Amino acid sequence: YKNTRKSPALIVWGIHHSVSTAEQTKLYGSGNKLVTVGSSNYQQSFVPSPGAR
Amino acid sequence: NFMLTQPHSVSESPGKTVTISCTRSSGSIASNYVQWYQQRPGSSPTTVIYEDNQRPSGVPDRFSGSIDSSSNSASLTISGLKTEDEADYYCQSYDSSNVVFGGGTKLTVLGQPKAAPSVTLFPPSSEELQANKATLVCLISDFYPGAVTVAWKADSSPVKAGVETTTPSKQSNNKYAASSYLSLTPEQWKSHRSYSCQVTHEGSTVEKTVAPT
Amino acid sequence: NFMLTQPHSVSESPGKTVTISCTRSSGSIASNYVQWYQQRPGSSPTTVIYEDNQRPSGVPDRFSGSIDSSSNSASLTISGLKTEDEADYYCQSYDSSNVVFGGGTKLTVLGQPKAAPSVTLFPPSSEELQANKATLVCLISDFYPGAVTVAWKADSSPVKAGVETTTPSKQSNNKYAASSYLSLTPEQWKSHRSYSCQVTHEGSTVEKTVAPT
Amino acid sequence: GIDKEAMGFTYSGIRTNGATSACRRSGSSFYAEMKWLLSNTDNAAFPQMTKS
């Protein structure tokens, strides 16, 4: 996404922590899951932590 | 939605190991959870597997779940069969808001050697042809295990309308018997060239044919 | 507590590849580290493998340790045998506060073809019976590789009571010979009908038996 | 000050007696208020658990 506007844009997003790896693999497929986010200022990467809450 | 397909008949000797497969028509098998229910005759079903491999507390460790994404199949597996494992086994899966049940599988622990069924196929009596009715009788006796599949064919072609098939019941000699009655009208009876009753047992087919006069 | 079990002799030709196995009777082999020590004849041991696959400084990278959870056993695999690798090999593991050593494996690099033992069992001399003493002599000779499992059997039953067994020695013909002595009392000698000496070599057993009169 | 209360956790099929000679209560011991959970000595595998 490119912010074409004159004001800073509030970008929000979620990372899903499924109840179990079984649930995680059933929804988003098997294998190690990984989400990265990057800009000029901000950079951060995320891996899901499945488990019971 | 989709449909699940298990074999009708599975048999093995005590202590041996069976597998009951369950194949999904549409959609991957690993896109939702699969169950395995068991129904011992005369009792409600109980669940021996959930989330495709998980045993409820109180289910012997010989039961296992599995998922083969290549064949799009989910497979129950029973090690060291007991005599109390003889039941019907239904697989189950899920879609948008739809709960799909497998056809059911009859698991037989062999207590006597297998015996192919004996088929005796009768035409309609001329007296019923006077009542403007027509009924075909396919009598199936002395088979073990107690699982059969009855298919009728109108001269070369499956006919499923008007068929009534009995659930196999044990005879006097610890072998199973069944019946299958195809209902027709005399105009359809004299119409075709021949009528057949196909009984399928343990992967073998015994076909018998009858004809007008 | 538990115990580790090794084979008595592992044999192969120069340059070939051996694997010495070390099976743990109780508890997982994987629940602790497994060490391998090497005792060259007449000298103190050194270590070859620690933490189940790690080699210290100066050990040829031919030596490779492994672990097998299914067989519940370890493995010491040597590639490209050299005549300097002939020694005794002990695995080692550990429990709560107790370190358990394996039985020992006699690694033999073949320099001649395998020879089966030549056994001869002498009963006690009647002169000896005058001293109220009984001595049975089981003499083994001309086997290769040198490793022997002597089992004494009074009339059907294992007797490890009075046995004293020499460690094999290099014969003049570059083969191995050893002796056994079951010390008894003339009552026990005259009690049972037969006294056997069973020698086991390459999983192949030979029985020589004596009897009074 | 602090008042302590048991949480009533019960473990099955694993080792709960982890200790070391660094926390030495006349022998290899561990923190009084914690439990060093280990794999079962029989099968070296730690199952997924849920304690609440």
Short mmCIF file of C-alpha atoms in Angstrom, two decimals:
data_model
loop_
_atom_site.label_atom_id
_atom_site.label_comp_id
_atom_site.label_asym_id
_atom_site.label_seq_id
_atom_site.Cartn_x
_atom_site.Cartn_y
_atom_site.Cartn_z
CA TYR A 1 0.00 0.00 0.00
CA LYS A 2 1.18 3.51 -0.89
CA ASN A 3 -0.07 6.46 1.16
CA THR A 4 -0.90 9.04 -1.50
CA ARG A 5 -2.41 11.45 1.06
CA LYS A 6 -0.86 14.38 2.95
CA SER A 7 -1.56 12.99 6.45
CA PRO A 8 0.08 9.93 8.04
CA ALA A 9 -2.00 6.78 7.66
CA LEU A 10 -2.97 4.54 10.60
CA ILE A 11 -2.36 1.00 9.32
CA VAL A 12 -3.60 -1.81 11.58
CA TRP A 13 -3.49 -5.57 11.18
CA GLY A 14 -3.87 -8.76 13.16
CA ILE A 15 -1.87 -11.95 13.71
CA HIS A 16 -4.00 -15.02 14.50
CA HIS A 17 -2.94 -17.41 17.27
CA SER A 18 -4.94 -20.55 16.54
CA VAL A 19 -6.06 -22.84 19.40
CA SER A 20 -3.62 -25.56 18.26
CA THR A 21 -1.24 -26.39 15.42
CA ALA A 22 -3.96 -28.76 14.20
CA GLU A 23 -6.32 -25.79 13.96
CA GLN A 24 -3.59 -23.60 12.47
CA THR A 25 -2.76 -26.19 9.79
CA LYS A 26 -6.45 -26.71 8.98
CA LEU A 27 -7.09 -22.99 8.36
CA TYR A 28 -3.87 -21.58 6.86
CA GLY A 29 -2.24 -24.79 5.63
CA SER A 30 0.64 -26.81 7.03
CA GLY A 31 4.20 -25.55 7.44
CA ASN A 32 5.95 -22.83 9.42
CA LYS A 33 3.89 -19.63 9.15
CA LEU A 34 5.48 -16.19 8.88
CA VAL A 35 4.24 -12.62 8.44
CA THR A 36 6.55 -9.66 7.75
CA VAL A 37 5.79 -5.95 7.75
CA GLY A 38 8.05 -3.23 6.39
CA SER A 39 8.21 0.47 5.57
CA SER A 40 10.94 3.11 5.47
CA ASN A 41 10.59 3.76 9.20
CA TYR A 42 8.94 0.63 10.58
CA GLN A 43 9.97 -3.01 10.21
CA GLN A 44 8.85 -6.04 12.22
CA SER A 45 8.11 -9.69 11.59
CA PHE A 46 5.62 -12.02 13.25
CA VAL A 47 5.17 -15.76 13.74
CA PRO A 48 1.94 -17.27 15.15
CA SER A 49 1.97 -18.74 18.68
CA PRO A 50 -0.73 -21.46 18.63
CA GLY A 51 -2.03 -22.60 22.00
CA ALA A 52 -4.95 -22.65 24.40
CA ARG A 53 -6.07 -19.36 25.96
CA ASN B 1 -21.41 -29.37 -0.45
CA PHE B 2 -19.60 -32.69 -0.86
CA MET B 3 -19.99 -36.40 -0.18
CA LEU B 4 -17.87 -38.92 1.72
CA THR B 5 -17.32 -42.50 0.53
CA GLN B 6 -16.47 -45.48 2.77
CA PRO B 7 -16.57 -49.15 1.76
CA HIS B 8 -19.68 -51.04 2.77
CA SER B 9 -17.86 -54.18 3.95
CA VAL B 10 -14.57 -54.71 5.80
CA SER B 11 -13.54 -57.98 7.44
CA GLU B 12 -10.53 -59.46 9.22
CA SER B 13 -9.41 -62.09 11.82
CA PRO B 14 -9.00 -61.29 15.53
CA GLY B 15 -5.65 -59.76 16.43
CA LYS B 16 -5.14 -58.64 12.82
CA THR B 17 -5.30 -55.01 11.63
CA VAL B 18 -7.98 -53.28 9.53
CA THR B 19 -8.22 -49.87 7.89
CA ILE B 20 -11.51 -48.17 6.99
CA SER B 21 -11.04 -45.43 4.40
CA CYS B 22 -13.23 -42.37 3.82
CA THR B 23 -12.91 -40.40 0.58
CA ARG B 24 -14.22 -36.88 0.00
CA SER B 25 -15.73 -35.99 -3.39
CA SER B 26 -15.18 -32.22 -3.47
CA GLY B 27 -12.80 -30.02 -1.48
CA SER B 28 -9.56 -31.16 0.17
CA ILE B 29 -9.68 -33.59 3.07
CA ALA B 30 -7.25 -31.48 5.14
CA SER B 31 -9.46 -28.35 4.97
CA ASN B 32 -11.56 -29.34 8.02
CA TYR B 33 -11.72 -31.82 10.90
CA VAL B 34 -12.84 -35.44 10.46
CA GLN B 35 -14.53 -37.69 13.04
CA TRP B 36 -15.04 -41.47 13.33
CA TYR B 37 -18.16 -42.70 15.12
CA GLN B 38 -18.89 -46.30 15.92
CA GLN B 39 -22.17 -47.91 16.35
CA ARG B 40 -22.51 -51.23 17.97
CA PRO B 41 -25.93 -52.63 16.96
CA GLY B 42 -28.74 -51.74 19.35
CA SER B 43 -26.84 -48.84 20.96
CA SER B 44 -26.38 -45.16 20.21
CA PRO B 45 -23.25 -44.15 18.27
CA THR B 46 -20.14 -43.20 20.20
CA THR B 47 -17.14 -41.23 18.98
CA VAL B 48 -13.77 -42.99 18.76
CA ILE B 49 -11.87 -40.24 16.87
CA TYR B 50 -12.06 -36.44 16.60
CA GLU B 51 -9.81 -33.81 14.98
CA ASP B 52 -8.79 -36.64 12.58
CA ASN B 53 -6.55 -38.49 15.06
CA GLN B 54 -7.57 -37.88 18.69
CA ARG B 55 -8.83 -40.64 21.01
CA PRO B 56 -11.42 -39.74 23.67
CA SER B 57 -10.55 -40.87 27.18
CA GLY B 58 -11.56 -44.52 27.27
CA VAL B 59 -10.81 -45.49 23.64
CA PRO B 60 -8.17 -48.25 23.28
CA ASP B 61 -4.84 -47.16 21.77
CA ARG B 62 -5.37 -49.62 18.90
CA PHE B 63 -7.65 -47.02 17.27
CA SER B 64 -5.75 -44.42 15.23
CA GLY B 65 -6.75 -41.55 12.97
CA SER B 66 -5.04 -40.45 9.78
CA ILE B 67 -5.30 -38.05 6.85
CA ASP B 68 -3.86 -38.80 3.41
CA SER B 69 -4.05 -35.57 1.41
CA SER B 70 -2.75 -37.31 -1.75
CA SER B 71 -5.69 -39.74 -1.99
CA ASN B 72 -8.00 -37.16 -0.30
CA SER B 73 -8.83 -39.83 2.26
CA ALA B 74 -9.12 -40.15 6.02
CA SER B 75 -8.40 -43.64 7.36
CA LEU B 76 -9.34 -45.24 10.67
CA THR B 77 -7.02 -48.08 11.72
CA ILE B 78 -7.68 -50.76 14.36
CA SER B 79 -4.81 -52.88 15.71
CA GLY B 80 -5.29 -56.25 17.41
CA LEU B 81 -9.00 -56.64 16.72
CA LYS B 82 -11.29 -57.76 19.51
CA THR B 83 -14.73 -59.29 19.14
CA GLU B 84 -16.34 -56.17 20.67
CA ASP B 85 -15.00 -53.97 17.84
CA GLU B 86 -17.66 -55.47 15.53
CA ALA B 87 -19.84 -52.47 14.68
CA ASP B 88 -20.66 -49.93 11.96
CA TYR B 89 -18.15 -47.10 11.44
CA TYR B 90 -19.23 -43.69 10.10
CA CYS B 91 -16.79 -40.96 9.06
CA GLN B 92 -17.83 -37.32 9.31
CA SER B 93 -16.51 -33.98 8.08
CA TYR B 94 -17.69 -30.41 7.66
CA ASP B 95 -18.30 -27.57 5.20
CA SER B 96 -19.72 -24.02 5.31
CA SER B 97 -22.71 -24.93 7.50
CA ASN B 98 -23.14 -28.53 6.31
CA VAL B 99 -22.33 -31.71 8.28
CA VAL B 100 -21.47 -34.59 5.92
CA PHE B 101 -21.81 -38.20 7.07
CA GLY B 102 -20.12 -41.16 5.41
CA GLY B 103 -22.17 -44.07 4.15
CA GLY B 104 -21.14 -46.35 6.99
CA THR B 105 -18.83 -49.37 7.02
CA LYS B 106 -19.69 -52.82 8.41
CA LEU B 107 -16.65 -54.19 10.28
CA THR B 108 -16.81 -57.97 10.72
CA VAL B 109 -14.40 -60.01 12.83
CA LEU B 110 -14.27 -63.36 11.01
CA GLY B 111 -15.61 -66.13 13.26
CA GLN B 112 -16.04 -68.62 10.40
CA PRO B 113 -14.65 -68.89 6.85
CA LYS B 114 -16.11 -66.59 4.22
CA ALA B 115 -18.98 -67.94 2.13
CA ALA B 116 -20.18 -66.38 -1.13
CA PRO B 117 -23.97 -65.82 -1.20
CA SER B 118 -26.47 -68.01 -3.02
CA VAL B 119 -28.78 -66.03 -5.32
CA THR B 120 -32.17 -67.31 -6.52
CA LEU B 121 -34.04 -64.96 -8.87
CA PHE B 122 -37.78 -65.42 -9.62
CA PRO B 123 -39.84 -63.72 -12.35
CA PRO B 124 -43.29 -62.25 -11.63
CA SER B 125 -46.08 -64.81 -11.45
CA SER B 126 -48.66 -64.78 -14.24
CA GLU B 127 -51.31 -64.28 -11.54
CA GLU B 128 -49.80 -60.99 -10.41
CA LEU B 129 -49.54 -60.01 -14.08
CA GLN B 130 -53.35 -60.32 -13.95
CA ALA B 131 -53.55 -57.98 -10.95
CA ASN B 132 -51.81 -55.51 -13.33
CA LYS B 133 -48.82 -55.71 -10.95
CA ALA B 134 -45.33 -57.20 -11.26
CA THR B 135 -42.77 -58.01 -8.58
CA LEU B 136 -39.25 -59.45 -8.85
CA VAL B 137 -37.87 -61.48 -5.94
CA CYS B 138 -34.12 -61.87 -5.42
CA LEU B 139 -33.43 -64.23 -2.51
CA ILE B 140 -29.91 -64.19 -1.03
CA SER B 141 -28.96 -66.91 1.45
CA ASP B 142 -26.00 -68.41 3.30
CA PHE B 143 -23.40 -65.64 3.11
CA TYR B 144 -20.80 -64.48 5.62
CA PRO B 145 -19.83 -61.78 6.49
CA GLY B 146 -23.28 -60.17 6.79
CA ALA B 147 -22.70 -57.36 4.26
CA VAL B 148 -24.13 -57.34 0.72
CA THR B 149 -24.93 -54.76 -1.96
CA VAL B 150 -27.96 -55.38 -4.19
CA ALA B 151 -28.11 -53.69 -7.59
CA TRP B 152 -30.88 -54.16 -10.16
CA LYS B 153 -30.46 -53.64 -13.91
CA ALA B 154 -33.22 -53.10 -16.49
CA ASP B 155 -31.90 -55.04 -19.48
CA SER B 156 -28.59 -53.24 -19.45
CA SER B 157 -29.17 -50.30 -17.14
CA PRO B 158 -29.35 -49.51 -13.40
CA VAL B 159 -32.89 -49.31 -12.00
CA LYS B 160 -33.12 -47.98 -8.44
CA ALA B 161 -36.83 -47.01 -8.32
CA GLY B 162 -39.17 -49.56 -6.78
CA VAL B 163 -36.43 -51.62 -5.09
CA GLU B 164 -36.80 -52.77 -1.48
CA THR B 165 -33.79 -54.47 0.11
CA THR B 166 -33.70 -56.18 3.49
CA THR B 167 -31.07 -55.75 6.13
CA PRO B 168 -29.07 -59.00 6.39
CA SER B 169 -30.13 -61.14 9.34
CA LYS B 170 -28.50 -64.26 10.74
CA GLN B 171 -29.94 -67.63 9.69
CA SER B 172 -30.04 -70.72 11.91
CA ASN B 173 -26.50 -71.76 10.89
CA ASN B 174 -24.72 -68.50 11.90
CA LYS B 175 -24.82 -67.29 8.29
CA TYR B 176 -26.69 -64.26 7.02
CA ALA B 177 -29.68 -63.96 4.68
CA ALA B 178 -31.38 -61.10 2.86
CA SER B 179 -34.05 -60.38 0.27
CA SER B 180 -34.60 -57.74 -2.41
CA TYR B 181 -37.94 -57.09 -4.13
CA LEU B 182 -38.13 -54.89 -7.23
CA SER B 183 -41.59 -53.42 -7.83
CA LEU B 184 -42.68 -52.92 -11.46
CA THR B 185 -45.78 -52.71 -13.64
CA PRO B 186 -46.60 -55.38 -16.28
CA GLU B 187 -46.11 -52.88 -19.09
CA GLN B 188 -42.49 -52.26 -18.01
CA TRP B 189 -41.98 -55.99 -17.37
CA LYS B 190 -42.80 -57.05 -20.94
CA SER B 191 -41.00 -53.93 -22.22
CA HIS B 192 -37.32 -54.82 -21.82
CA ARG B 193 -35.20 -57.82 -22.84
CA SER B 194 -34.11 -59.11 -19.42
CA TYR B 195 -33.90 -58.23 -15.74
CA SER B 196 -30.92 -58.86 -13.47
CA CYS B 197 -30.24 -58.97 -9.73
CA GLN B 198 -26.58 -58.25 -8.91
CA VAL B 199 -25.43 -59.22 -5.40
CA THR B 200 -22.00 -57.93 -4.38
CA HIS B 201 -20.12 -59.64 -1.54
CA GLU B 202 -16.53 -58.98 -0.42
CA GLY B 203 -15.64 -57.58 -3.84
CA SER B 204 -17.18 -60.44 -5.85
CA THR B 205 -20.36 -60.08 -7.93
CA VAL B 206 -22.87 -62.87 -8.53
CA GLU B 207 -25.31 -61.87 -11.29
CA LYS B 208 -28.55 -63.66 -12.11
CA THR B 209 -30.93 -62.84 -14.96
CA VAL B 210 -34.59 -63.52 -15.66
CA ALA B 211 -36.82 -62.75 -18.64
CA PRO B 212 -40.51 -62.81 -19.64
CA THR B 213 -41.56 -66.44 -20.25
CA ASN C 1 17.97 -48.44 37.28
CA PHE C 2 18.56 -50.20 33.93
CA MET C 3 21.31 -51.89 31.96
CA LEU C 4 22.91 -51.54 28.54
CA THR C 5 23.43 -54.52 26.24
CA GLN C 6 26.20 -54.83 23.64
CA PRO C 7 27.23 -57.67 21.32
CA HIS C 8 30.33 -59.58 22.39
CA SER C 9 32.15 -59.39 19.03
CA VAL C 10 31.70 -57.24 15.93
CA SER C 11 33.81 -58.41 12.99
CA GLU C 12 34.64 -56.94 9.58
CA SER C 13 37.38 -56.69 6.96
CA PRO C 14 39.74 -53.70 6.62
CA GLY C 15 38.24 -50.62 5.01
CA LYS C 16 34.67 -51.87 5.56
CA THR C 17 32.06 -50.22 7.81
CA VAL C 18 30.91 -51.51 11.21
CA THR C 19 28.12 -50.40 13.55
CA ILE C 20 28.25 -51.39 17.23
CA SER C 21 24.79 -51.24 18.83
CA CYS C 22 23.98 -50.52 22.49
CA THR C 23 20.42 -51.31 23.61
CA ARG C 24 18.96 -49.82 26.80
CA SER C 25 16.67 -52.15 28.73
CA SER C 26 14.57 -49.64 30.70
CA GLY C 27 13.68 -46.04 29.93
CA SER C 28 14.28 -44.20 26.67
CA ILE C 29 17.80 -44.14 25.30
CA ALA C 30 17.00 -40.58 24.17
CA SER C 31 16.29 -39.29 27.70
CA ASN C 32 20.05 -38.94 28.28
CA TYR C 33 23.37 -38.59 26.50
CA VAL C 34 25.20 -41.75 25.35
CA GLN C 35 29.01 -41.87 25.38
CA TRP C 36 31.35 -44.29 23.61
CA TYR C 37 34.75 -45.15 25.08
CA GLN C 38 37.58 -47.03 23.35
CA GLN C 39 39.94 -49.32 25.27
CA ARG C 40 42.89 -50.45 23.18
CA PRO C 41 44.34 -53.69 24.58
CA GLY C 42 46.27 -53.43 27.85
CA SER C 43 45.75 -49.64 28.08
CA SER C 44 43.39 -47.13 29.66
CA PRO C 45 40.30 -46.03 27.72
CA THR C 46 39.76 -42.85 25.73
CA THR C 47 36.52 -41.27 24.51
CA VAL C 48 35.47 -41.32 20.85
CA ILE C 49 31.85 -40.09 20.96
CA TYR C 50 30.05 -37.89 23.48
CA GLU C 51 26.55 -36.34 23.53
CA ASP C 52 25.63 -39.20 21.13
CA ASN C 53 27.27 -37.71 18.05
CA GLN C 54 30.03 -35.28 19.10
CA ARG C 55 33.73 -36.17 18.59
CA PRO C 56 36.48 -34.68 20.78
CA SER C 57 39.78 -33.36 19.41
CA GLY C 58 41.87 -35.98 17.59
CA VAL C 59 39.25 -38.64 16.71
CA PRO C 60 38.94 -39.57 13.00
CA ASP C 61 35.67 -38.34 11.51
CA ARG C 62 34.98 -41.94 10.47
CA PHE C 63 33.63 -42.53 13.98
CA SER C 64 29.96 -41.47 14.01
CA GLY C 65 27.51 -42.09 16.85
CA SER C 66 23.73 -42.18 16.51
CA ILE C 67 20.52 -42.96 18.40
CA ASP C 68 17.47 -45.03 17.41
CA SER C 69 14.27 -44.45 19.39
CA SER C 70 12.40 -47.37 17.77
CA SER C 71 14.95 -50.06 18.69
CA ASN C 72 15.70 -48.04 21.89
CA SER C 73 19.39 -48.45 21.09
CA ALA C 74 22.47 -46.39 20.32
CA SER C 75 24.96 -46.96 17.52
CA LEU C 76 28.71 -46.47 16.99
CA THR C 77 29.42 -46.57 13.24
CA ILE C 78 33.04 -46.77 12.02
CA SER C 79 33.79 -46.18 8.32
CA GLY C 80 36.97 -47.37 6.62
CA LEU C 81 38.31 -49.62 9.38
CA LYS C 82 42.01 -49.41 10.15
CA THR C 83 44.01 -52.03 12.04
CA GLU C 84 44.49 -49.40 14.78
CA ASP C 85 40.73 -49.59 15.52
CA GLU C 86 40.89 -53.10 17.01
CA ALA C 87 39.95 -52.55 20.67
CA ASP C 88 37.13 -52.98 23.19
CA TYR C 89 34.20 -50.54 22.99
CA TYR C 90 31.92 -49.61 25.90
CA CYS C 91 28.88 -47.41 25.56
CA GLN C 92 27.71 -45.40 28.57
CA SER C 93 24.52 -43.68 29.68
CA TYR C 94 23.17 -42.24 32.91
CA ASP C 95 20.16 -42.29 35.22
CA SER C 96 19.16 -40.28 38.34
CA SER C 97 22.59 -40.58 40.01
CA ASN C 98 23.88 -43.83 38.51
CA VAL C 99 26.21 -44.25 35.52
CA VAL C 100 25.68 -47.53 33.61
CA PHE C 101 28.37 -49.08 31.42
CA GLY C 102 27.71 -51.47 28.56
CA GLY C 103 28.95 -55.04 28.59
CA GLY C 104 31.69 -54.35 26.06
CA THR C 105 32.19 -55.10 22.35
CA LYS C 106 35.35 -56.79 21.03
CA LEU C 107 35.95 -55.13 17.65
CA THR C 108 38.10 -57.44 15.50
CA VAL C 109 39.61 -56.48 12.13
CA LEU C 110 39.85 -59.68 10.10
CA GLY C 111 43.41 -60.63 9.11
CA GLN C 112 42.53 -64.27 8.44
CA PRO C 113 39.36 -66.25 7.70
CA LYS C 114 36.88 -67.08 10.44
CA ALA C 115 37.57 -70.32 12.32
CA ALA C 116 35.12 -72.30 14.46
CA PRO C 117 36.24 -73.52 17.92
CA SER C 118 37.60 -76.99 18.72
CA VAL C 119 36.16 -77.95 22.13
CA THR C 120 37.22 -80.79 24.44
CA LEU C 121 35.76 -81.30 27.93
CA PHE C 122 37.62 -83.43 30.50
CA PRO C 123 35.74 -84.83 33.52
CA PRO C 124 37.34 -84.76 36.99
CA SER C 125 40.30 -87.10 37.45
CA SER C 126 39.60 -90.00 39.81
CA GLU C 127 42.85 -88.98 41.53
CA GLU C 128 41.20 -85.64 42.27
CA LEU C 129 38.17 -87.39 43.76
CA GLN C 130 40.54 -88.72 46.45
CA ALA C 131 41.17 -85.11 47.56
CA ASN C 132 37.38 -84.58 47.99
CA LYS C 133 37.71 -82.15 45.04
CA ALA C 134 36.14 -82.04 41.57
CA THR C 135 37.45 -79.98 38.63
CA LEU C 136 35.97 -79.99 35.14
CA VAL C 137 38.13 -78.62 32.32
CA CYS C 138 36.59 -77.28 29.11
CA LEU C 139 39.35 -76.45 26.62
CA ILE C 140 38.57 -74.24 23.61
CA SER C 141 41.04 -73.78 20.77
CA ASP C 142 41.48 -72.52 17.19
CA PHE C 143 38.77 -69.90 16.73
CA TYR C 144 38.81 -66.46 15.11
CA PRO C 145 37.71 -63.77 15.93
CA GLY C 146 38.59 -64.41 19.56
CA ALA C 147 35.35 -64.06 21.53
CA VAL C 148 33.54 -66.91 23.30
CA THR C 149 30.35 -67.38 25.35
CA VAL C 150 30.95 -70.38 27.63
CA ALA C 151 27.77 -71.67 29.30
CA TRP C 152 27.96 -74.55 31.79
CA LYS C 153 24.89 -76.78 32.18
CA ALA C 154 24.57 -79.42 34.91
CA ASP C 155 22.31 -82.02 33.27
CA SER C 156 19.84 -79.51 31.87
CA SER C 157 20.26 -76.35 33.92
CA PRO C 158 22.63 -73.37 33.80
CA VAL C 159 25.31 -73.44 36.50
CA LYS C 160 27.39 -70.26 36.79
CA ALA C 161 28.35 -71.15 40.39
CA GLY C 162 31.92 -72.40 40.33
CA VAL C 163 32.93 -71.40 36.79
CA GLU C 164 36.12 -69.42 36.15
CA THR C 165 36.81 -68.58 32.50
CA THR C 166 40.06 -67.28 31.04
CA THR C 167 40.12 -64.40 28.59
CA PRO C 168 41.06 -65.52 25.05
CA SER C 169 44.73 -65.56 24.06
CA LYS C 170 46.51 -65.43 20.71
CA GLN C 171 47.64 -68.97 19.85
CA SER C 172 50.90 -69.63 18.01
CA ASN C 173 48.94 -70.11 14.74
CA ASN C 174 47.44 -66.58 15.06
CA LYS C 175 44.15 -67.97 16.37
CA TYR C 176 42.50 -67.75 19.78
CA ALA C 177 42.11 -70.34 22.55
CA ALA C 178 40.56 -70.23 26.02
CA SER C 179 39.71 -72.48 28.97
CA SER C 180 36.91 -72.96 31.51
CA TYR C 181 36.89 -74.54 34.97
CA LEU C 182 33.74 -75.60 36.84
CA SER C 183 34.93 -76.40 40.37
CA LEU C 184 32.61 -78.81 42.20
CA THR C 185 32.36 -81.32 45.02
CA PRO C 186 32.31 -85.10 44.29
CA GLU C 187 28.73 -85.21 45.57
CA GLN C 188 27.46 -82.79 42.93
CA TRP C 189 29.56 -84.57 40.30
CA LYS C 190 28.09 -87.99 41.17
CA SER C 191 24.64 -86.39 41.65
CA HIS C 192 23.73 -85.32 38.11
CA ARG C 193 23.91 -87.61 35.08
CA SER C 194 25.69 -85.23 32.68
CA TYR C 195 27.72 -82.01 32.81
CA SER C 196 27.92 -80.04 29.56
CA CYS C 197 30.15 -77.22 28.35
CA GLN C 198 28.44 -75.04 25.73
CA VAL C 199 30.64 -72.70 23.68
CA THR C 200 28.93 -70.06 21.54
CA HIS C 201 30.81 -68.60 18.56
CA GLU C 202 29.26 -66.38 15.88
CA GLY C 203 25.82 -67.29 17.21
CA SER C 204 26.75 -70.94 16.53
CA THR C 205 26.82 -73.17 19.61
CA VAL C 206 28.68 -76.44 20.23
CA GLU C 207 28.07 -78.74 23.20
CA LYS C 208 30.60 -81.15 24.67
CA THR C 209 29.38 -83.28 27.59
CA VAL C 210 30.91 -85.61 30.19
CA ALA C 211 29.39 -88.00 32.74
CA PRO C 212 30.68 -90.06 35.69
CA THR C 213 31.75 -93.56 34.54
CA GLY D 1 4.18 -9.11 52.89
CA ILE D 2 3.08 -12.03 50.74
CA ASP D 3 0.67 -14.86 51.53
CA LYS D 4 1.01 -17.99 49.42
CA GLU D 5 -1.71 -20.39 48.24
CA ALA D 6 -1.48 -23.62 46.27
CA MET D 7 -2.69 -23.55 42.67
CA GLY D 8 -3.59 -27.25 42.62
CA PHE D 9 -1.85 -28.27 39.39
CA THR D 10 -1.70 -32.05 38.82
CA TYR D 11 0.65 -33.56 36.21
CA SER D 12 0.39 -37.03 34.64
CA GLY D 13 2.89 -38.85 32.47
CA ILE D 14 5.84 -36.45 32.85
CA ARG D 15 8.69 -35.88 35.27
CA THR D 16 8.08 -33.06 37.75
CA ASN D 17 11.18 -33.53 39.98
CA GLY D 18 13.76 -31.44 38.11
CA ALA D 19 16.56 -30.15 40.33
CA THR D 20 20.22 -29.14 40.40
CA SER D 21 23.05 -28.74 42.87
CA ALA D 22 22.88 -24.97 42.32
CA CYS D 23 19.77 -24.76 44.55
CA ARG D 24 21.27 -26.97 47.25
CA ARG D 25 18.87 -27.91 50.08
CA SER D 26 21.23 -30.56 51.54
CA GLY D 27 21.12 -32.10 48.04
CA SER D 28 20.18 -31.30 44.47
CA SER D 29 16.93 -29.36 44.93
CA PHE D 30 15.01 -26.59 43.14
CA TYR D 31 12.94 -23.46 43.79
CA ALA D 32 10.45 -24.09 46.60
CA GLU D 33 7.54 -22.47 44.74
CA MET D 34 8.15 -23.84 41.23
CA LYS D 35 8.29 -27.18 39.43
CA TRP D 36 10.89 -28.00 36.76
CA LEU D 37 8.82 -30.17 34.42
CA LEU D 38 10.77 -32.77 32.41
CA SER D 39 9.93 -35.44 29.87
CA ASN D 40 8.87 -38.87 31.05
CA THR D 41 11.87 -41.11 31.75
CA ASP D 42 10.14 -43.89 29.78
CA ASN D 43 9.32 -42.02 26.55
CA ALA D 44 11.44 -38.95 25.77
CA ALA D 45 8.62 -36.70 24.58
CA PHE D 46 6.85 -33.79 26.25
CA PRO D 47 3.14 -33.70 25.33
CA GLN D 48 1.26 -30.45 24.81
CA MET D 49 -0.45 -29.52 28.08
CA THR D 50 -3.01 -27.03 29.36
CA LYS D 51 -3.04 -25.95 33.02
CA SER D 52 -5.47 -23.29 34.23
#
